[PDB]
């Protein structure tokens, strides 16, 4: 299996710069797929950006067309989006996605389409046809016809993960990561609740794992709070029976990663 998509790019961009994101597809059965881009701003709905199909042809949200450029490199299974002159209004989660885009010939009620004419033949050349004169239609001229209208179909098949992009002048602050233990509130507990405090960072997001992904069950990573310092903090905790324990904290905007050792002794 199944196509999977992964967005990559900066989590923070300064106003007036170009935002450049990459979409990498993996695991498709197919040689190529049409790929679109959609964003969701805080408290807004979803908004279409544009797409590139397997023939290299692009289409854009007309509102954003003059600021957008979508390109591809199929040899890397990648599609790129660039959006010029960003402002804080362009802060959003950006998704890439596979898209189905198709133009349909629509006919009035009572009219057939297709080359399946029924003892009848040569209906294929007509968009919208009826063989209704009273007997067999051996030629295209024996059929009643009208010109079809065109109906456009668009939908998303598979969605990416989503990349959070903040457009802001604000400086980055890498988190300070502190180890936590609930031990001292209940030293005879059968289990120990460990944690990490990811203190005082900007902008979002951070990612937390435990033991490089080996510890997943029992992990609870909490949404961040925006503090009076003007910085964010969040915490992550994991409960373990009464072995090294390490929280793995990445803050993409600052290119920092901290793997913090937490003592499970109690």
């Amino acid at each position: 299996a199944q196509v999977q998509l992964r967005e990559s790019g900066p989590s923070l961009v300064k106003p007036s710069q170009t935002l450049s994101l990459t979409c990498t597809a993996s695991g498709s059965s197919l040689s190529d797929e049409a790929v679109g881009w959609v964003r969701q701003a805080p408290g807004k709905s979803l908004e279409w950006l544009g797409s590139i199909d397997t023939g290299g042809n692009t289409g854009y949200n007309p509102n954003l067309k003059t600021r957008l450029s979508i390109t591809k490199d199929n040899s890397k299974s990648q599609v790129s989006l660039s959006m010029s002159s960003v402002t804080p209004e362009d802060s959003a989660t950006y998704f890439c996605a596979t898209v189905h885009q198709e133009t349909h010939q629509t006919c009035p009620d009572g009219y057939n389409s297709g080359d399946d004419c029924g003892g009848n033949w040569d209906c294929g050349t007509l968009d919208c046809w009826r063989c209704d004169w009273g007997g067999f239609c051996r030629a295209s001229t024996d059929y009643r016809s009208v010109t079809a209208t065109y109906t456009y179909e668009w939908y998303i098949d598979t969605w990416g993960q989503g990349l959070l992009v903040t457009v802001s002048s604000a400086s980055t602050t890498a988190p300070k990561v502190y180890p936590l233990s609930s031990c001292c509130g209940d030293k005879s507990s059968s289990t120990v609740t460990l944690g990490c405090l990811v203190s005082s960072y900007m902008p979002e997001p951070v990612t937390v794992t435990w033991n490089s992904g080996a510890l997943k069950s029992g992990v609870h990573t909490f949404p961040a709070v925006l503090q009076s310092s003007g910085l964010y903090s969040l915490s992550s905790m994991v409960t373990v029976p009464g072995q090294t324990f390490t929280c793995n904290v990445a803050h993409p905007a600052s290119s920092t990663k901290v793997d913090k050792a937490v003592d499970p002794r109690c």
Partner: protein
């Protein structure tokens, strides 16, 4: 924003049916080929429906959809807690590579079990204290419905200064999480016999306590 009109909020009850409408114009929803998407805040959408009525691969037949003229409808039968999510309709708009979305609908599923909060209270780390700061961290999980109030105590006094508490955030199991931070100096931390995080939920309070003498 959202070009296609949807109710901002709908509620149904466990095991029953609910419907979400999606209104547009003759040039979008009126043309057919409406799609529907399910999203959990902070996560990627999932396609439910395409072509007005066709379920996407792996979507169960509990989800169905229909259209009449300029109004599309998604119906979810046998409601489960996992159906709580935001739902968006969409359509092409004048081209197969131009799309418009609905304004989104948040679905609430009533009738779910009440669940008190689990509370974990962490003291300050030695490393943080070495910088003359002490942050107490109160982590609150698995509560339903999604409303708590948090009170901090120190030796019987209520502390409101330098408290910051998050909104409740729906977890995957439709229960909620929140966190509260009390940001102290190291001296203020060490001055006291004990601190407590008292979490009230549907009139019941769950309290955890740490003692600087036990914890530092």
């Amino acid at each position: 924003q959202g070009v296609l009109t949807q109710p901002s909020s709908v509620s149904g009850s466990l095991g029953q049916r609910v419907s979400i409408t999606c209104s547009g114009s003759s040039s979008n929803v009126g043309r057919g080929y409406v799609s529907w998407y399910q999203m959990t805040p902070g996560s990627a959408p999932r396609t439910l429906i395409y072509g007005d009525t066709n379920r996407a691969s792996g979507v169960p037949d509990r989800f169905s959809a229909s259209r009449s003229g300029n109004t599309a409808t998604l119906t979810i039968s046998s409601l489960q807690a996992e159906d709580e999510a935001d739902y968006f309709c969409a359509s092409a708009e004048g081209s197969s590579s131009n799309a418009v979305f609905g304004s989104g609908t948040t679905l609430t599923v009533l009738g779910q079990p009440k669940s008190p909060p689990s509370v974990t209270l962490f003291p300050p780390s030695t490393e943080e204290l070495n910088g003359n700061k002490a942050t107490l961290v109160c982590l609150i999980s698995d509560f339903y419905p999604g409303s708590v109030t948090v009170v901090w105590k120190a030796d019987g006094s209520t502390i409101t200064r330098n408290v910051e508490t998050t909104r409740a955030s729906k977890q995957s199991n439709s229960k909620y999480a929140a966190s509260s931070y009390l940001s102290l100096t190291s001296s203020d931390w060490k001055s006291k016999g004990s601190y407590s995080c008292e979490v009230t939920h549907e009139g019941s309070t769950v309290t955890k306590t740490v003692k600087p003498s036990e914890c530092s």
